[PDB]
Write a protein that holds these residues in place. Structure first.
Motif, PDB file in Angstrom:
ATOM      1  N   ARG A   1      69.861   2.624 -11.904  1.00 42.00           N
ATOM      2  CA  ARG A   1      68.567   1.906 -12.481  1.00 42.00           C
ATOM      3  C   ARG A   1      67.438   2.783 -12.436  1.00 42.00           C
ATOM      4  NH1 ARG A   1      66.883  -3.688 -11.891  1.00 42.00           N
ATOM      5  NH2 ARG A   1      64.791  -3.504 -12.688  1.00 42.00           N
ATOM      6  N   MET A   2      67.276   3.658 -11.321  1.00 39.45           N
ATOM      7  CA  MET A   2      66.229   4.571 -11.119  1.00 39.45           C
ATOM      8  C   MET A   2      66.189   5.788 -12.324  1.00 39.45           C
ATOM      9  SD  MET A   2      63.773   4.817  -9.020  1.00 39.45           S
ATOM     10  CE  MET A   2      62.388   5.944  -8.311  1.00 39.45           C
ATOM     11  N   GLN A   3      67.439   6.122 -12.715  1.00 41.02           N
ATOM     12  CA  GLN A   3      67.658   7.075 -13.734  1.00 41.02           C
ATOM     13  C   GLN A   3      67.168   6.403 -14.989  1.00 41.02           C
ATOM     14  OE1 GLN A   3      69.623  10.186 -14.341  1.00 41.02           O
ATOM     15  NE2 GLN A   3      68.899  10.148 -16.381  1.00 41.02           N
ATOM     16  N   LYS A   4      67.509   5.023 -15.426  1.00 37.95           N
ATOM     17  CA  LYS A   4      67.249   4.430 -16.626  1.00 37.95           C
ATOM     18  C   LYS A   4      65.635   4.024 -16.761  1.00 37.95           C
ATOM     19  CE  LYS A   4      67.771  -0.357 -18.274  1.00 37.95           C
ATOM     20  NZ  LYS A   4      66.859  -0.876 -17.377  1.00 37.95           N
ATOM     21  N   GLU A   5      65.010   3.656 -15.502  1.00 33.08           N
ATOM     22  CA  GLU A   5      63.722   3.245 -15.583  1.00 33.08           C
ATOM     23  C   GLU A   5      62.518   4.641 -15.726  1.00 33.08           C
ATOM     24  OE1 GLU A   5      62.646   0.343 -15.891  1.00 33.08           O
ATOM     25  OE2 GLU A   5      64.652  -0.675 -15.591  1.00 33.08           O
ATOM     26  N   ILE A   6      63.177   5.608 -15.209  1.00 29.30           N
ATOM     27  CA  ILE A   6      62.116   6.841 -15.404  1.00 29.30           C
ATOM     28  C   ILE A   6      62.382   7.627 -16.664  1.00 29.30           C
ATOM     29  CG2 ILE A   6      61.563   9.060 -14.392  1.00 29.30           C
ATOM     30  CD1 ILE A   6      62.236   8.165 -11.732  1.00 29.30           C
ATOM     31  N   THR A   7      63.584   7.235 -17.300  1.00 29.05           N
ATOM     32  CA  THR A   7      63.875   7.666 -18.619  1.00 29.05           C
ATOM     33  C   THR A   7      63.080   7.053 -19.619  1.00 29.05           C
ATOM     34  OG1 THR A   7      66.091   8.184 -18.073  1.00 29.05           O
ATOM     35  CG2 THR A   7      65.604   8.231 -20.319  1.00 29.05           C
ATOM     36  N   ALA A   8      62.805   5.822 -19.510  1.00 31.00           N
ATOM     37  CA  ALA A   8      62.052   5.118 -20.204  1.00 31.00           C
ATOM     38  C   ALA A   8      60.470   5.425 -20.234  1.00 31.00           C
ATOM     39  CB  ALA A   8      62.213   3.318 -20.020  1.00 31.00           C
ATOM     40  N   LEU A   9      60.228   5.887 -19.067  1.00 25.42           N
ATOM     41  CA  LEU A   9      58.766   6.292 -18.695  1.00 25.42           C
ATOM     42  C   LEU A   9      58.477   7.757 -19.165  1.00 25.42           C
ATOM     43  CD1 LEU A   9      58.111   4.616 -15.364  1.00 25.42           C
ATOM     44  CD2 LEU A   9      57.117   3.906 -17.485  1.00 25.42           C
ATOM     45  N   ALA A  10      59.362   8.501 -18.833  1.00 25.62           N
ATOM     46  CA  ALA A  10      59.176   9.982 -19.334  1.00 25.62           C
ATOM     47  C   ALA A  10      59.589  10.271 -20.803  1.00 25.62           C
ATOM     48  CB  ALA A  10      60.316  10.977 -18.418  1.00 25.62           C
ATOM     49  N   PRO A  11      58.887  11.680 -21.170  1.00 29.30           N
ATOM     50  CA  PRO A  11      59.363  11.901 -22.624  1.00 29.30           C
ATOM     51  C   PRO A  11      60.653  12.136 -23.017  1.00 29.30           C
ATOM     52  CG  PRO A  11      57.268  13.046 -21.825  1.00 29.30           C
ATOM     53  CD  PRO A  11      57.924  12.300 -20.683  1.00 29.30           C
ATOM     54  N   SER A  12      61.256  12.041 -24.029  1.00 24.61           N
ATOM     55  CA  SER A  12      62.729  11.808 -24.358  1.00 24.61           C
ATOM     56  C   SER A  12      63.273  13.125 -24.237  1.00 24.61           C
ATOM     57  CB  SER A  12      62.795  11.495 -25.807  1.00 24.61           C
ATOM     58  OG  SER A  12      62.203  10.277 -26.192  1.00 24.61           O
ATOM     59  N   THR A  13      62.258  14.456 -24.240  1.00 22.90           N
ATOM     60  CA  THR A  13      62.993  15.704 -24.154  1.00 22.90           C
ATOM     61  C   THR A  13      63.156  15.972 -22.515  1.00 22.90           C
ATOM     62  OG1 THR A  13      60.773  16.690 -24.241  1.00 22.90           O
ATOM     63  CG2 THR A  13      62.115  16.435 -26.410  1.00 22.90           C
ATOM     64  N   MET A  14      62.756  15.366 -21.774  1.00 21.04           N
ATOM     65  CA  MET A  14      62.893  15.596 -20.296  1.00 21.04           C
ATOM     66  C   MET A  14      64.333  15.269 -19.875  1.00 21.04           C
ATOM     67  SD  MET A  14      60.020  17.294 -19.381  1.00 21.04           S
ATOM     68  CE  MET A  14      60.501  18.041 -20.709  1.00 21.04           C
ATOM     69  N   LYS A  15      64.802  16.069 -19.029  1.00 18.91           N
ATOM     70  CA  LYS A  15      66.135  15.582 -18.444  1.00 18.91           C
ATOM     71  C   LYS A  15      65.912  14.943 -17.049  1.00 18.91           C
ATOM     72  CE  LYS A  15      68.662  19.332 -20.903  1.00 18.91           C
ATOM     73  NZ  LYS A  15      69.622  20.463 -20.487  1.00 18.91           N
TER      74      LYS A  15
END
Ligand SMILES: Nc1ncnc2c1ncn2[C@@H]1O[C@H](COP(=O)(O)OP(=O)(O)O)[C@@H](O)[C@H]1O
Ligand SMILES: Nc1ncnc2c1ncn2[C@@H]1O[C@H](COP(=O)(O)OP(=O)(O)O)[C@@H](O)[C@H]1O
Ligand SMILES: Nc1ncnc2c1ncn2[C@@H]1O[C@H](COP(=O)(O)OP(=O)(O)O)[C@@H](O)[C@H]1O
Ligand SMILES: [Mg+2]
Ligand SMILES: [Mg+2]
Ligand SMILES: [Mg+2]
Lengths: 393, 366, 366, 366, 57
Positions: free
Chosen positions: B303-317
């Motif tokens: 869930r933490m991975q999914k929520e930060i991915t939605a906030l961060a730019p798409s090119t960030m890992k």
């Protein structure tokens, strides 16, 4: 036990306020790696960039803030000044070495300079190349050492302008520094051939020698300690800056050998025999590391490091007689930038506001022990110790 | 033999430097009798207070990372040294841990008690987020430490901390325990006393999890009984809970469930990265380290991975590092640090403290 | 094996004589930490400072062609010899470069460091404008060298330099970077730190160009989106710029954009030709050579051709020579010079300098 | 009867041209309910949002001098005209204020809303730094305007602005409020909500001051209780603060307290004077005008005098002009300008804007 | 005390909540360690502090 027993493990450096600094000072641009700064409890001497010839700026300690661009300087040399050293027995006498292959001794008025000082007290002419090393004798009065780039060491009597000793056949390459021992009977030296030599000047002999004290080709420094040992700074074969403690009775292997970093710039050691703390200030560095030399292994004990964000071009150290004892101050360093001199205070944190007996033993006084005529005969005496409790406020 | 003591708002982990796990892990509670003795000890600490909690009033000396009573705080430390570790504190150096942005007044009391009450020969106080990064073998990363009292996000890059980017969330394990007690009354179970807080906390640590998609999980719980679990109370009574399993940890991501105005742990971590320099955010995105007991919910890392991915730019890992022993990461990092040869220069002696004071502790420490 | 070191205000190009390109090209920056280290090197130079710039404060030791700190200037040279080329400086003769009308005090420090600090066996200092003319195979022509610090116009005729006609413009690459940072805030992007200076410089080198007609380009950018380009920041955020692409290099031709009273690079080049004798201006119009990184904007040669043609008489043939490798023209011309046979008489031995001084360096050099 | 509207990041000052003080001064906030109404207005603006802030989420439509939401920006202007001034905007010409180096896209939206939404007959946009110089009765001097969003240093000489010397500092009143909340948690006081941000801002405006010597004041606060002040919260609870009174405004002179790399307001003012011509710096040293609410700390002018004197040469006379009404210097200067007979030629009619567009607003204005 | 040392002297009648800004005896530069009323004067109290001094009030 867990923590090594010491009094200086928590010494911290603190730069003074901006109004207590010395701004608008055209510090010298000479590649020679000397301290550029000489300070006594009375004046502050900084080697400055002269438009023609050589000159250094003598100004009282009270004269802080921005200095006038037309402030009178000690402009007597026809070449750039390389080294300056205050007389330990006369707060108004300072010797200076320059690239004109001469050494000049000056007399500074009590209130400083009102007009530029051009004529010295005595012009010591004996070297054929530039003189970049000057060291007053710690006990004998009016005895001065000078080491030029002609690889010769000369002992002068300033009072009579005489050359007491000439030591020409002892250094085959460039001499880096010369440091007297405690009483003044020997002096050590680092050379460009990576050799550390201990020399008796009055007998012209080589007491001890350690070839290849540091394997690197970058400069070295060698100073005498109060107990009679040699503390050296240098570079390893991998160009790593090192510290080394040497026992002159047994120079087969160093007592200690620690590596600091892999930066350039020579490490200038500032030894304090009262506290047995060596302050290592690298030229071009922004930090000051201090170590405690004791008898417990590994002998060299890293205390702490004062860090800043400006690289230092020079560094002067205030003797014990000029420190503020009432504030637990054990060292003051006048860090030279390119256009400013910033004093840095080293203090031992103590809850008590009384006089600290353990921090301030009896220090060497401004009174000479012997004289030039008595020291030549072969007399050896310890520096006259004074008390610092009277300086407490 | 150095001691590593990790005092949290809920649990106290203590042991010896060089070991892999704390030898003593007990609740940081002090229990006092609330009835009158009729048959011919006025306080209980830790597990002895947990076994007699039926007749005791339980209090935590630390609330939200703040010591509310220092007399009970000394009882925890005395219980640690003499009852749990069974050592003489005047014979071992002690490595202590502190929360990020810890007030200097709190560190001075901790240093004064260790040197004057327990007479420890040496002492050092380390930051908990830095120790959690030692345990993961990293010098770069933002640590999200959520324990029992508070939640912190501490970005560290190449061994340098960014204190201006450290964010704090007044929401951790104890706030989730109180929220579970509130929503358990909606199901017919009434827990009110301090002794029943420890029962609900045990239900939370065993049955609660983080849902990947909360609204889909709420729909599955409303149309099926697959998510229901049973729990046996100390008196043999069995209770059953359904959506309360993932609604309680959901308050970590939606603090509005508690009436709070702040953002969730995912946005607090993201906002702490955005307060850092643009040139270090890429490494902080790939080194998000979880620490503490409140990060031990099943499915909290996905869930933490999914929520930060939605906030961060798409090119960030986005890479959430959740080690399986992150409940003890602060202590493990302290046991690693206190064993290094390069650390023995950081000890503050008792003799040095008596002559210098706490000024040498504000320096040397961070 | 002679070394050819080209030290500029922004970049340092070093290599070996005889090669066709510099082997070491790194930024002439020194970075120092601005935070406190919390986990158990005080300065960084070049690319090691550019990769850790998020926690560093970056400084250029050379500003406007003037060395502002020689301690950091030696860190650049030590990084060049020992970290980039990985050679022993006491074994190779080094060919150095100097700006036109270089102060003698600046050359004396450069010579004194190479002989005393690094102990080079031989050394020589060449003029950067003369080397840029060697790289193009010409003995006659006016070179407009625009780097990161300053812009110079040096007329050379039949191998003879005209020092009285050399003009200087305190406006180069670093002033265009600072101007781009200012006009980017007008679009909503705030770049303030020294680490973000390197980001804007990267935006300038990739998206900026010189408009042939500035007012026509400002009208096209105001009624269309064809001139808009996107750029991805290190943290993955994408910014978009439109007319800032050709407004930033426009300050080269209109220094009044920066509040400067001086003339543009086109009038500075024309004024430098008019300071020469009338009998040599014809060949200077036909041999205008561009040099430096600031001359690498797309369309700067055609704009330079258009502006000088308007200033010069109608019968003269204006020819702007912009080789595709003019970013390294100074180093290439140095690698050509140090490889010739008639140049070995120009070396200055370390033994000659120790007995004579910098006087032999003032002679022999121009 | 012309209107003078001074919109800032924190406060909105409005009134009529010719008066000595703004008739309407209210916070530029928009509050929205964050709870659910249970008893049988979806947004609040200004003082009505400040009185219901206990159940609202407060937002500033302007952050760091940048309008983050224009829908809430129009709510401020509608609240200004109809609720505060209680005027019909289609009957009065309006004089607006803009920050230095204001983006043209920001000025176009301001002009477009005033003509199309409010239908004002005439309009003009003046620079806030120039108006602050009208209020002091000068045409020469550098204005350091520090409000709630950003800090600017604008040099003006003989009525001529030097835009190349205008410097900006992303550090003003709101950054000092957020820093006061951070260091208040070090004392045991937790303020986290947006409603408590307005409480901390009220503590800052009443108890904070600038220390002449910061380290001397820290030693006085460490050995005495004479610098401690009490403050009563809205619920009657009293807090006591000591060194936080002068540590919060100290961030203006040491931005490193906020993790910023920039310089203080004293060096930003000095650097702005040094970017001007050498022949005008003498008059800028003697005419340093303070403007804005962030310049209202007790002792900020003496500290500003002491710091600039240490940077400037000894023969220069540093004179900080801090009028006691400098919180409204921008509005007062606007009321003075809008009443001059030589200003009526600067109005831009609504009929002119409908047929020409914002191009006539980019001209005429600066 | 925020700085130095102080101790609160309040009359026995002054009960209830005490004002946070109530005047204290704040003459010590270090935290007060011990206080003791004079047995022969109900208005004289001595105080010891960490500043290594004893102040009689
Ligand atoms: N397996 C688990 N699942 C969910 N929560 C847990 C688990 N284990 C422990 N916790 C919670 O972690 C909190 C404290 O963890 P810890 O990191 O030790 O905090 P502290 O550092 O404050 O002692 C407790 O409130 C407990 O409820
Ligand atoms: N492709 C490019 N387009 C525009 N500018 C460039 C380009 N490449 C480099 N520059 C600029 O050129 C400047 C330095 O060029 P150079 O002449 O190598 O510097 P110096 O000789 O002073 O070290 C830098 O400021 C950089 O921004
Ligand atoms: N007396 C005071 N002391 C310190 N700060 C103040 C005082 N009065 C107002 N301020 C601060 O000034 C800021 C806004 O001032 P102002 O210049 O009106 O802002 P703006 O120009 O953005 O409207 C607020 O953040 C407030 O905290
Ligand atoms: Mg914890
Ligand atoms: Mg160049
Ligand atoms: Mg304003």
């Amino acid at each position: 036990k867990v923590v090594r027993q010491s009094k200086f493990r928590h010494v911290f450096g603190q730069p003074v306020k901006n109004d207590q600094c010395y701004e608008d000072i055209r510090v010298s641009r000479v590649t020679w790696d000397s301290t550029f700064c000489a300070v006594n409890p009375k004046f502050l001497a900084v080697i400055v960039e002269a438009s023609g010839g050589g000159a250094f700026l003598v100004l009282p300690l009270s004269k802080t803030g921005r200095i006038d661009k037309a402030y009178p300087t000690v402009c007597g040399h026809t070449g750039p000044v390389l080294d300056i050293d205050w007389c330990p027995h006369n707060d108004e006498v300072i010797a200076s070495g320059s690239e004109d292959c001469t050494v000049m001794v000056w007399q500074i008025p009590e209130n400083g300079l009102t007009s530029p000082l051009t004529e010295p007290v005595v012009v010591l002419e004996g070297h054929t190349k530039r003189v970049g090393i000057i060291a007053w004798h710690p006990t004998a009065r009016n005895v001065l050492l000078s080491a030029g780039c002609d690889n010769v060491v000369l002992i002068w009597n300033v009072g009579t302008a005489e050359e007491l000793y000439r030591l020409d056949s002892l250094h085959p390459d460039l001499i880096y520094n010369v440091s007297w021992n405690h009483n003044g009977s020997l002096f050590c030296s680092a050379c460009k051939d990576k050799s550390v030599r201990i020399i008796d000047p009055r007998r012209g002999t080589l007491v001890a020698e350690r070839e290849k004290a540091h394997e690197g080709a970058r400069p070295m420094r060698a100073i005498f300690l109060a107990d009679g040992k040699v503390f050296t700074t240098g570079f390893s074969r991998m160009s790593e800056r090192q510290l080394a403690l040497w026992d002159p009775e047994n120079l087969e292997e160093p007592m200690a050998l620690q590596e600091l970093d892999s930066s350039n710039g020579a490490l200038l050691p500032f030894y304090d025999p009262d506290t047995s703390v060596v302050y290592v200030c690298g030229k071009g560095d922004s930090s000051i590391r201090y170590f405690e030399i004791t008898e417990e292994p590994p002998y060299i004990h890293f205390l702490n490091t004062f860090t800043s964000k400006e690289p230092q071009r020079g560094m002067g150290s205030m003797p014990k007689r000029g420190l503020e004892v009432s504030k637990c101050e054990i060292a003051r360093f006048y860090k030279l930038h390119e256009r400013k001199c910033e004093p840095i205070v080293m203090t031992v944190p103590r809850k008590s506001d009384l006089f600290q007996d353990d921090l301030y033993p009896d220090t060497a006084g401004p009174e000479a022990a012997l004289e030039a005529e008595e020291w030549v005969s072969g007399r050896d005496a310890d520096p006259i110790l004074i008390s610092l409790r009277e300086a407490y406020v | 033999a150095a001691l590593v003591v990790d005092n949290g708002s809920g649990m106290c982990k203590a042991g010896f430097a060089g070991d892999d796990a704390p030898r003593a892990v007990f609740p940081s509670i002090v229990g006092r009798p609330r009835h009158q003795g009729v048959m011919v000890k006025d306080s209980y600490v830790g597990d002895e207070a947990q076994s007699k909690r039926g007749i005791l009033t339980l209090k935590y000396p630390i609330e939200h990372g703040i010591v509310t009573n220092w007399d009970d705080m000394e009882k925890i430390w005395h219980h640690t040294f003499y009852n749990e570790l069974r050592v003489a504190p005047e014979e071992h150096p002690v490595l202590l841990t502190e929360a990020p942005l810890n007030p200097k007044a709190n560190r001075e009391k901790m240093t004064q008690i260790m040197f004057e009450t327990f007479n420890t020969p040496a002492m050092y106080v380390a930051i908990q987020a830095v120790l959690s990064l030692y345990a993961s073998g990293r010098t770069t990363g933002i640590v999200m430490d959520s324990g029992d009292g508070v939640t912190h996000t501490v970005p560290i890059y190449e061994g340098y901390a960014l204190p201006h980017a450290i964010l704090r969330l007044d929401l951790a394990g104890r706030d989730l325990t109180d929220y579970l007690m509130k929503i358990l009354t909606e199901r017919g179970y009434s827990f009110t006393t301090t002794a029943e807080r420890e029962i609900v906390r045990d239900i939370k640590e065993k049955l609660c999890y983080v849902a990947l998609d909360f609204e889909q999980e709420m729909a599955t719980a409303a149309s099926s009984s697959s998510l229901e679990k049973s729990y046996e109370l100390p008196d043999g009574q069995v209770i059953t809970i359904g959506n309360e399993r993932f609604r309680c940890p959901e308050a970590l991501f939606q603090p509005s469930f508690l009436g709070m105005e702040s953002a969730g742990i995912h946005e607090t971590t993201f906002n702490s990265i955005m307060k850092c320099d643009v040139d270090i955010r890429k490494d902080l995105y790939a080194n998000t380290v979880l620490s503490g007991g409140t990060t031990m919910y099943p499915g909290i890392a996905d869930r933490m991975q999914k929520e930060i991915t939605a906030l961060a730019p798409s090119t960030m890992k986005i890479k959430i590092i959740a080690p399986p022993e992150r409940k003890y990461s602060v202590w493990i990092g302290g046991s690693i640090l206190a064993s290094l040869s390069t650390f023995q220069q950081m000890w503050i002696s008792k003799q040095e403290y008596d002559e210098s004071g706490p000024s040498i502790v504000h320096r040397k420490c961070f």
